[PDB]
Amino acid sequence: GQTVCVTGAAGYIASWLVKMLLEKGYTVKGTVRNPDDPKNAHLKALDGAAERLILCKADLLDYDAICRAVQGCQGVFHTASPVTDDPEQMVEPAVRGTEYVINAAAEAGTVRRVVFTSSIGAVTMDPSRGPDVVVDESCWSDLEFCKKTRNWYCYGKAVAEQAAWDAARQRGVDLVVVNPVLVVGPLLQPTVNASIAHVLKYLDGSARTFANAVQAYVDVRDVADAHLRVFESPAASGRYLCAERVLHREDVVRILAKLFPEYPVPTRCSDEVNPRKQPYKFSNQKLRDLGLEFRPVSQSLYDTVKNLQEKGHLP
Ligand SMILES: NC(=O)c1ccc[n+]([C@@H]2O[C@H](COP(=O)([O-])OP(=O)(O)OC[C@H]3O[C@@H](n4cnc5c(N)ncnc54)[C@H](OP(=O)(O)O)[C@@H]3O)[C@@H](O)[C@H]2O)c1
């Protein structure tokens, strides 16, 4: 019976974090732009929301608004963040917004641990990285490479994380980070987020081809579960990579064609001339060591399409 804060509580990954929290007798203070906007309707109907959900009005760049939500809480889950390649609304709002939380939780005075939601964008983005090496928590991105290629979401997450590590040390608050990859799964929120858009663009004919690239995948519930496990585990420390497996673009559109042949999923590749990129080795032992059984991607991709259809996003 403790109290915790979750920023951007009505987000894709966040909405699942609240459900799990509310189900274990946690009081959840959910920061949103407007507690009475319809966007948050899907939070007031959870088993424990009426009793222990409290929607706090707060922008992420409003220091005082954060302190109001963070105050009285034993833990904080900073999930809110911009998700875009526009650096003007990504980079500084992420570092300032993140530093506000650490300070606010450090400001006063019950918080034993903060959990920041970083990204894989601050891990695997380094072309100097070898093909043989296992991508683990000690892997960081080349910030110059991100800047040269306009990868500002990956940039912002890297800086926002390192800023959180600094801010945490400077103020002496317990921090532990979770690095989810491209997340996918059932949507609780009524709107389509950025990661689902990468999945949905195959199923609505937005794409007639798929790129010659690779990427890691994880279920949204595996993420929400990770944040909760890394928080409750006392000895939990450092970063925590959160992924199930690495797939090629081809392997993805195959799984979707497999279970959904009535949709116009791509079959042809954008390259077809250079050798297809092979998936990279990675480690998710830190989360597994905490007793986390990852849901298969294929199983998670299915619940997504079934969810999107039920909610009108797909015919
Ligand atoms: N989903 C993934 O695949 C993935 C992978 C790696 C890391 N992450 C990170 O996980 C966290 C949540 O991701 P997500 O999938 O849940 O994305 P999301 O649902 O689309 O956005 C999360 C929430 O953050 C809010 N937000 C952003 N800027 C804000 C601001 N200045 N003030 C108040 N609220 C703000 C958003 O509100 P608005 O919609 O109104 O802007 C949204 O409700 C993020 O840090 C994300 O970068 C996600």
TrEMBL record:
Residues the entry annotates as binding NADP(+): Y12, I13, R33, D59, L60, T79, K157, V183, S195
GO molecular function list: cinnamoyl-CoA reductase activity; nucleotide binding; oxidoreductase activity, acting on the CH-OH group of donors, NAD or NADP as acceptor
UniProt KW NADP keyword: yes
Ribosomal protein found in the keyword field: no
Keywords assigned by UniProt, alphabetized: Disulfide bond, NADP, Nucleotide-binding, Oxidoreductase
Domain of life: Eukaryota
Top EC category: oxidoreductase
NAD-dependent epimerase/dehydratase domain span: 4-237
Pathway in which this enzyme or protein is active: Aromatic compound metabolism; phenylpropanoid biosynthesis
EC number: 1.2.1.44
Signal peptide range: none
UniProt family annotation: Belongs to the NAD(P)-dependent epimerase/dehydratase family. Dihydroflavonol-4-reductase subfamily.
Name of protein: cinnamoyl-CoA reductase
Species, as recorded: Sorghum bicolor (Sorghum)
